[PDB]
Design a protein around this nucleic acid. Structure first.
Lengths: 186, 95, 168, 197
RNA sequence: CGGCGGCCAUAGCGGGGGGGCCACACCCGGUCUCAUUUCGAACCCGGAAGUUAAGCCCCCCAGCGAUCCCGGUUGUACUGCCCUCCGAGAGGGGGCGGGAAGCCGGGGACGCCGCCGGCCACUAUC
RNA sequence: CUCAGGCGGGUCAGGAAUCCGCCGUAGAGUGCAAGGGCAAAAGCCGGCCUGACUGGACCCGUAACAGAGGCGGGUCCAGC
RNA sequence: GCCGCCGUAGCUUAGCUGGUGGAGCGCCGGACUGUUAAUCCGGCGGUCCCCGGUUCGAAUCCGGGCGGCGGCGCCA
C-alpha cells in the first residue's frame, strides 16, 4: 500500500537518531469565525469557555462589509488558544468527532490540519444544550518542531532551514499515533 | 527652477542606492573631528537629522568648534564665508 | 497627418513615457508577426538602417503591408516568417493652425504651442534591424524584392542595404 | 537585500538577532562606558566596555566561572543572586581600575523589575560604583538573599511522589544545595570591597 | 565553541558531513518577581532528569545573487581641445587628451578583522 | 511588534470579516501633490503625557555666489 | 481653436454630504363598458453616457473620451 507506509518509516528513522528530530503539537485553537455575534457579544461565547476550561478573547471587526464586519470594532468571533494537557484533553474527543480515516486532503503543506465540523462536538450535558444551543466552529491544530523556540524569542532570531521545518509526511503519522486512524489509499 | 526650495533638484544627492538603504551605521554618526580639521560634508540620505542645505554637498570646510551636539564648520561658498552647522553623521575626516 | 518633415530627425528629443503625460495617442499598427514560427528556417535576411531617423506609425503599417502582401500572394503563408521588430514609442507634437484668415490668427506663436498627440514613432539609429524576414534559399528572391520596396518608405535612406546575416 | 540587489543593507548583528544598532548608538552618544550585562541560560556576564573604531575594548571582565573559583560561591550560575555577586565582583575592579561610571546596557530585552539586569546593577551600586539610575527597579529582598527558593523547594520535591505536594520537575535536584540557604549567600557577599572583609 | 564590536551580501539562497557541545539550545516547574483584551507561546522567577536533533561551532560544495580579476567584444560605445577639415542637412573624421555597460570564456568568492572571557588551558582550540 | 500580496488547510454560492501554517527586502504604511527618508522603524499596537513651554542667542534660508523686508528652519545655553 | 453646461426607467425630467432612486409619459396584465375610448386598480426595466482613479464602497468627487447647448472667432 501507500500514504501510511512511507510516512511511518521516516518517523521511526527520526527516533533512531534521537527523538528531538520528531515534531510536537504546539497548540489547539478552537474558533468560531463564521460568526453568529452580529453587532452584539454572542452567547456562543460562554459555551466555548466551559468547553476549553479557561478565558476567551473577543475578536473585533474590520471595515464595512455586507454580511459580517458590518461596522468596524463590533464582535464577530471568539477564540481560545489551548496549550498543555487542556489541548490534549480536547483532541482525544475532537478527533473521534470528526469522521475517522482522517483526511490527508485537509493537511496543510506544513504537516498541520484544520477541522471544519459545525454543530456537533461531544460530551453531554455540556453540549445538548438548554436553553442556548446555537454554535459552529473551525478547529486548527498547529504542529511544528520543538527546537523552533529560539526564532520566537528576541535572542538568536534568524532563519530556520527547511531541514528543520515540519512537512506533510510527519504530521499524518503523529496525529494517528495519538488517537484515531489516518486515511490510507491503495 | 520651477520652484525654489532646498530639496529641489536634489533627488539624486538625497537618494541612496537600494543596497545602501536602511538605517545608517552608527560609527559615522559618532565620528569626532578636531578643530583645524578639515571635514567633507556629505548628506547621508538615511539619517534625517543633522542635515545641511543640500546645495552644500561635496564641500570641504574646517571645524571651528561646536554648538550643542552638532559641529560648526567654516566653508567658503563662492565669495561668502559661511557657517554650516552639521552633525558628525554627515561629516567625514579629510584624507 | 502632415507630411513627415519631423520624422526624419533624431536631434528632436524624447517625450516618450505614455503613463507620464496626460494624453497619449492610439496605435495604427496591430500586426507585427505573420507566417510560420521562426524556428523552421535557417537563413535570415535583414534590412539594415544606415541613417538615424524616427519612423512614423503610419509608415510602419504601410511599408509592412505592401511587403507582406507580396510575400503572402506569391509564396503563401505556409512558408516565410516576417517580423518588423520595432514598436513606435516616441510621441509627436503639433502647434494648432488652420485656415481662418482675415482678422483671425490660427496661429498663434505660444498660448500653449505644446503638443496634442499626432502619433507615435520608432527610433532607428545605425546598424539596426528595421526588418527581419526568415527564409530558405528557394525563397531568397522574394525576400530581397520586398526589402527594396521597404527602403523607399524609409524616411531617409539605407546605405548598408539588403543584408545576408547569414543566419548565425 | 534578499536574493537580488534590492532595498536595504543587512548587518551582522541584525542577521544573528542580537543588540539593536539604534539602542547602542543612543547609549554611546554621551561618551560614557557601557556596563554590559548579558544573559545566558546558566551564565551571567558583566563587562565594562568602551567604544573604539577598532572594535570595543573591555577594561575589566567579571564572569560566573571566575566567581565559582575562590569566592566560596558553589551556587547555581544562572539564578538571580549569582548576578548579585557579579556586580560585587566587578566592584573590586572598579577600585583597582578606578572607573566607576558606566550606564546599563541590557541590549534587547524589556526593562521590568524582578529581572536579572536590575539585580547585578543593585550589586554594583552597593559595591560603591556611581552609575545613573532611579530607585524603583531593584528586586525585593526575598529575591536577593535567596529564600523564596527554600520555601518553594519544600512545596515541591522530585524523587518523592505523594497526594501531598511533592510535585515533579525542577526544585534543586542537587545535594550540595538541597534548596539553597541564604547563609551561603552572606558568606560570599562578605567578600565585599576590595579588602575582602 | 562565551560576550562586545569593526567592515557591512566576498558574511543573500541552498545543501553535505563531523562535534573534540561543562560553557551554548532544547527541556522540564512555573508557587513566586513577571508577560497575555486568550494560553509560560510572549515576559520573567526556578531547575537539569533527558536530547545533539536541530541551533551552534567546525570542515566543505556555487546551481541562483552579489564581490574581484584576466582576456575577448573594446581602446569599441561615448567624450574635452583644435580644424578657411569633410557632409545639402542629419552627421562625421583627424590630431590632442581621456574611456562605460551589458555579455562570453577561464578563474578567485559559501568572509575578513579588533577587545575580553572560559572546562581544558596557561598554548590554541571546539 | 512587522507588512502589501501570494500558497496550502477552514467558513461561504462565491465572498467578506474572522482562523491556522508557509512564502514574502518593502509592492504596505507614514493626513494630503510629488519626490526624497524609513522594517528589531518614523510604520503597527498600548500606556503615560502635553516642549504646539518661557528667555535670549548663533546660523541658514528667504534673496546661491551678491545688498534684500516679512516669514520659516537647524543648532546652543539658562529656566520650568 | 478657446470658455461654461448635459446625458438618469422605452421618452422627458426631479435628484446625489459618495451608502439613495423617482415622478408625468409610453408599454404590459386585470377591471368598468355592449365593445371602446376616457376612467379605474397591478407592474416592471435604470451598469443613473464611455473609460480611468481615490475610497472600505462613486449614480454622486476628481482625469480623460463621445455626442448634444450657449458665448468669442475680433480693434486688426
Amino acid at each position: 500500500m501507500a500514504v501510511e507506509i512511507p510516512n511511518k518509516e521516516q518517523i521511526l528513522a527520526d527516533w533512531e537518531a534521537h527523538p528531538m528530530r520528531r515534531p510536537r503539537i504546539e497548540k489547539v485553537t478552537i474558533n468560531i469565525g463564521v460568526g453568529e455575534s452580529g453587532e452584539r457579544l454572542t452567547k456562543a461565547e460562554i459555551m466555548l469557555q466551559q468547553l476549553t476550561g479557561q478565558k476567551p478573547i473577543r475578536r473585533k471587526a474590520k471595515k464595512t462589509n455586507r454580511d459580517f464586519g458590518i461596522r468596524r470594532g463590533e464582535p464577530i468571533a471568539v477564540k481560545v488558544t489551548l496549550r498543555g494537557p487542556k489541548a490534549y484533553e480536547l483532541l482525544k474527543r475532537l478527533l473521534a468527532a470528526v469522521d475517522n480515516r482522517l483526511k490527508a486532503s485537509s493537511f496543510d503543506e506544513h504537516g498541520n490540519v484544520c477541522f471544519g465540523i459545525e454543530e456537533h462536538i461531544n460530551i453531554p450535558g455540556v453540549e445538548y444544550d438548554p436553553e442556548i444551543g446555537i454554535f459552529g466552529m473551525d478547529v486548527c491544530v498547529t504542529l511544528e518542531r520543538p527546537g523552533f523556540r529560539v526564532a520566537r524569542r528576541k535572542r538568536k532570531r534568524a532563519k530556520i532551514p527547511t531541514r528543520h521545518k515540519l512537512t506533510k509526511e510527519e504530521g499524518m503519522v503523529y496525529m494517528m499515533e495519538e488517537f484515531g486512524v489516518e486515511i490510507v489509499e491503495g | 527652477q520651477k520652484a525654489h526650495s532646498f530639496r529641489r533638484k536634489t533627488r539624486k544627492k538625497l537618494s541612496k542606492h537600494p543596497r545602501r538603504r536602511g538605517l545608517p551605521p552608527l560609527t559615522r554618526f559618532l565620528q569626532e573631528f578636531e578643530v583645524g580639521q578639515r571635514v567633507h560634508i556629505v548628506i547621508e540620505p538615511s539619517y534625517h537629522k543633522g542635515m545641511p542645505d543640500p546645495r552644500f554637498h561635496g564641500r570641504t570646510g574646517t571645524v571651528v568648534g561646536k554648538r550643542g551636539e552638532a559641529y560648526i564648520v567654516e566653508i567658503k561658498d563662492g565669495s561668502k564665508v559661511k557657517t554650516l552647522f552639521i552633525h558628525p553623521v554627515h561629516l567625514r575626516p579629510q584624507k | 497627418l502632415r507630411p513627415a518633415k519631423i520624422d526624419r530627425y533624431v536631434d528632436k528629443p524624447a517625450y516618450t513615457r505614455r503613463e507620464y503625460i496626460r494624453g497619449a495617442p492610439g496605435p495604427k499598427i496591430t500586426i507585427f508577426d505573420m507566417g510560420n514560427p521562426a524556428g523552421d528556417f535557417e537563413f535570415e535576411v535583414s534590412l539594415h538602417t544606415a541613417e538615424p531617423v524616427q519612423i512614423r506609425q503610419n509608415a510602419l503599417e504601410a511599408a509592412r503591408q505592401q511587403v507582406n502582401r507580396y510575400l503572402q500572394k506569391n509564396v503563401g503563408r505556409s512558408n516565410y516568417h516576417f517580423k518588423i521588430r520595432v514598436y513606435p514609442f516616441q510621441v509627436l507634437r503639433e502647434n494648432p493652425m488652420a485656415t481662418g484668415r482675415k482678422a483671425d490668427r490660427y496661429g498663434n506663436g505660444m498660448r500653449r504651442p505644446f503638443g496634442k498627440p499626432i502619433g507615435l514613432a520608432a527610433r532607428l539609429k545605425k546598424d539596426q534591424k528595421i526588418l527581419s524576414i526568415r527564409v530558405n534559399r528557394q525563397h531568397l528572391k522574394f525576400a530581397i524584392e520586398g526589402a527594396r520596396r521597404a527602403a523607399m518608405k524609409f524616411p531617409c535612406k539605407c546605405y548598408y542595404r539588403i543584408y545576408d546575416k547569414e543566419g548565425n | 537585500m534578499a536574493h537580488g540587489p534590492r532595498y536595504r543593507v543587512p548587518f551582522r548583528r541584525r542577521r544573528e538577532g542580537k543588540t539593536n544598532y539604534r539602542k547602542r548608538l543612543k547609549l554611546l552618544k554621551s561618551g560614557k562606558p557601557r556596563l554590559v550585562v548579558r544573559k545566558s541560560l546558566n551564565h551571567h556576564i558583566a563587562q565594562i566596555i568602551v567604544y573604539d573604531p577598532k572594535g570595543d575594548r573591555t577594561l575589566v571582565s567579571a564572569h560566573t566561572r571566575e566567581l565559582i573559583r575562590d569566592f566560596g560561591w558553589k551556587g547555581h550560575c544562572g539564578n538571580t543572586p549569582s548576578a548579585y555577586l557579579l556586580g560585587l565582583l566587578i566592584g573590586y575592579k572598579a577600585k583597582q581600575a578606578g572607573i566607576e561610571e558606566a550606564i546599563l546596557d541590557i541590549g534587547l530585552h524589556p526593562p521590568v523589575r524582578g529581572s536579572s539586569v536590575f539585580a547585578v546593577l543593585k550589586g554594583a551600586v552597593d559595591a560603591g560604583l556611581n552609575v545613573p539610575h532611579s530607585p524603583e527597579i531593584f528586586p525585593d529582598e526575598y529575591r536577593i538573599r535567596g529564600e523564596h527558593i527554600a520555601e518553594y523547594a519544600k512545596m515541591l520535591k522530585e524523587q518523592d511522589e505523594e497526594k501531598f505536594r511533592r510535585q515533579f520537575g525542577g526544585y534543586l535536584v542537587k545535594g550540595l544545595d538541597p534548596e539553597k540557604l541564604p547563609e551561603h549567600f552572606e558568606e560570599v557577599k562578605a567578600r565585599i570591597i576590595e579588602k575582602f572583609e
